[PDB]
Design a protein around this ligand. Structure first.
Ligand SMILES: C[S@@+](CC[C@H](N)C(=O)[O-])C[C@H]1O[C@@H](n2cnc3c(N)ncnc32)[C@H](O)[C@@H]1O
Length: 261
């Protein structure tokens, strides 16, 4: 019934070959070849981003959608891509990342990118069972893809409910992954959340066409229906016609060394 639901149904009908070309058609991608090998060879001082997450956060920050500062909380930090990137930001003073880790999940990576000394990454943490703490900047990049739109909605609702307790502590800046923004009940939930805490939804072009993920960010302000519908229509339009080339880009160089605080 919604355009996003139409997109999801069409996505599930695609052959594996059509899906493969479709998911990268006209997207933005960072070149990670050089970063992956240095990280594999244990290079910690090359300015290499631990994951392609640093570039997704950089995209949002560089466009003014988020202005990180003070104490940053990174929920579902994984290897630490958002945490290490936030530590390079002048107004940022402390970064605390939390992640599940363990078998089948990303573990925090220890690197020496610029500002690494203000980053604490904690593994073995279930953020859904941890008490919210005050912070200035709240980041959350949780939301596992599913072929079922009901499973995506249930997972998004779980993330947004947990994030609610942290937003109650009133951070001035936030960036929250919204895995499933495209069902009718999700658009109503997001409009209510936007009226209460502000911000708006943004589509990052580094996201694959195989996900409808959007980011709820403190610096945006847009009609929920409009913003989600615009994304749904872009994703639907890429399902037909030629395969468009990927816009390749240099990955973020996060420099090296400590910061004085
Ligand atoms: C998409 S990744 C984050 C990528 C990260 N922003 C980066 O730039 O490297 C989401 C992470 O959240 C973790 N995660 C998922 N559910 C979690 C939970 N209940 N508690 C803590 N971490 C969780 C996953 O293990 C995964 O490492």
């Amino acid at each position: 019934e919604t355009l996003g639901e139409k997109w999801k149904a069409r996505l599930n009908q695609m052959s594996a070959l059509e899906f493969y070309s479709y998911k990268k058609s006209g997207i933005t991608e960072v070149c990670r070849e050089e970063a992956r090998r240095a990280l594999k060879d244990g290079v910690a001082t090359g300015g290499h981003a631990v994951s392609r997450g640093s570039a997704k956060l950089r995209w949002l920050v560089e466009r003014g959608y988020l202005q990180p500062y003070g104490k940053v909380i990174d929920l579902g930090c994984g290897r630490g891509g958002w945490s290490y990137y936030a530590a390079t930001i002048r107004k940022v003073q402390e970064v605390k990342g939390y992640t599940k880790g363990g078998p089948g999940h990303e573990e925090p990576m220890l690197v020496q990118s610029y500002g690494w000394n203000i980053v604490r990454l904690k593994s073995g943490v279930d953020v859904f069972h941890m008490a919210a703490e005050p912070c200035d900047t709240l980041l959350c990049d949780i939301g596992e893809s599913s072929s079922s739109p009901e499973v995506e909605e249930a997972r998004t609702l779980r993330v947004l409910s947990m994030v609610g307790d942290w937003l109650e502590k009133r951070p001035g800046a936030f960036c929250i992954k919204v895995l499933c923004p495209y069902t009718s009940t999700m658009m109503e939930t997001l409009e209510r959340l936007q009226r209460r805490y502000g911000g708006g939804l943004v589509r990052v072009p580094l996201s694959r066409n195989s996900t409808h993920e959007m980011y709820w960010v403190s610096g945006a302000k847009s009609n929920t229906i409009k913003s989600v519908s615009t994304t749904s229509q872009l994703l639907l339009g890429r399902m037909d016609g030629p395969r468009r080339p990927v816009k390749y880009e240099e990955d973020v160089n996060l420099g090296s060394g400590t910061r004085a605080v």
